[PDB]
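User: Show me an example of a complex going from sequences to structure tokens.

Assistant: Sure. Here are the input components:
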Amino acid sequence: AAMAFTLADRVTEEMLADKAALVVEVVEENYHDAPIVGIAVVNEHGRFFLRPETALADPQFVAWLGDETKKKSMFDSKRAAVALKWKGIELCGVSFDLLLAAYLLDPAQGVDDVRAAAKMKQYEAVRPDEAVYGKGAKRAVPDEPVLAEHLVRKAAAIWELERPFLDELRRNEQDRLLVELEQPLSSILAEMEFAGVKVDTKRLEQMGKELAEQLGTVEQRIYELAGQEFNINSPKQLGVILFEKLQLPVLKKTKTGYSTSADVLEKLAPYHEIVENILHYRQLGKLQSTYIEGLLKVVRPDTKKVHTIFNQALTQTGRLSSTEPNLQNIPIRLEEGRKIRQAFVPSESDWLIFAADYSQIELRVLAHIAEDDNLMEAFRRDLDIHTKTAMDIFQVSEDEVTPNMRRQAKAVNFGIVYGISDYGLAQNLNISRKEAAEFIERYFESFPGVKRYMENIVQEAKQKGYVTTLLHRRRYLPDITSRNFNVRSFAERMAMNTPIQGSAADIIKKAMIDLNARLKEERLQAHLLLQVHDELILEAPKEEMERLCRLVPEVMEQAVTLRVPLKVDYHYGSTWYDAK
DNA sequence: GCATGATGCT
DNA sequence: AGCATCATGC
């Protein structure tokens, strides 16, 4: 039974009411400089569909869009906001975003369209986007009658679902999390994505050139050591040359066939000169394929800029994800990949890259939530946490902790974070489980408060059905009651870890909001470019560096008040590579 | 078209 | 942990 609506030929005053559900449809997944396919407005006066060419050319409609006092409820308003920024139009007054409300209520649902969110409340009078647009190749905008009905039905759902969603968010004590955190953050992310990051493609093209040289050299060497040419990129052909032709030991297998996993080849290293070349070849290869060739594909030729899209409603912990390209995983660990960061430059002459990062925010958050005296005292002293952990679990003085001891205490801290899995520890430390488990027990002896928190949180997750973060983000853990050891075990590790990774996500999001408010009050030209989980990257005139050196760390450190201090380090330079 | 398995980051 | 991407290959 079709839904009633006016298929408008011109904008009317009726369509410019004080409150409305608004749909500004951008069908391309990547909404940067993309077409707006149609518009729908549902308010107390009715339902309307507007062709974009006419409404976006109407001064009253554009003014209504930018009027902060004209409240709009939408689904993924960041997508619309950015598609409109590319058209020189400002979107304001978005007081409710259904995608974000759904995400906060339950991130595991995987809500990615209005139909998915509506189903959460037994509302199914709207179709899934995939159903009307199709998938991949066959994707396509349908004819106006079909298109117009779909947009109006989506707008009507938002109009109807706003109250029940806000009601549940309030019961969950998540209303402010939505209104004061995620929604204001959405607008900040829109500015970042729209601004983009400048790329020195000539540099990138020079690197790919040398990398192509190296690659070819290591690849030929590998054919020598193997005695024949094969597809090094095929773990299949790889596994046969290593474990059959060269008879290397099988220390590990995969579902079917052999495992050429990274650390397996690490173990194999000692036996053959070919293993080191395959690992090096894999390193240069990832650099070439993903970070030179892949990057170059998404750079806009007109501006030499790259515009990521931050998925704000995907992760189970409250973290953001980044795509097309992923700017949260640019190489930094090994020096050869790190050089890729030389290609990321300021978008204006005489401007520089400024990067600030939290120092151990997770362990600091853990010290705070577990209220572990030893852990809190360690951060209050701003101690090297890995040396301090080594001192404690190995029972030696700072003087006697050796590099191998620190590396292992560091391994327990890296693991500790993510629910401290001893099976995974043992593999990381390449030790037996009984030994890994021994490390863990010595940790809990030294950090009793952390032990108690892990126990208490697992009990809570069981009792309530979910765990929450500092700012009330929530994660349901149905598997924590499983009678299957493994399944139940993972959920218990999520119960321990989510409040840690999730609260750190909360903290840095609030810092971003606080920072932009300060940057504006100061009328600084400096602005955010990226966020990579525990660090913020900006660019600004070289003349603003000194003010930034003082402003950025302070805002980040003061975003929330914990039982221990928050510490932020920062650097700046002429390329991302130099902001170190 | 997909998943498998691999590397990259926090 | 759990994100995103890319090459293979069925």
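The lines above are the inputs; the final block is the predicted structure for all three components together. The domain at 195-309 of chain A is CATH 1.20.1060.10 (Taq DNA Polymerase; Chain T, domain 4).
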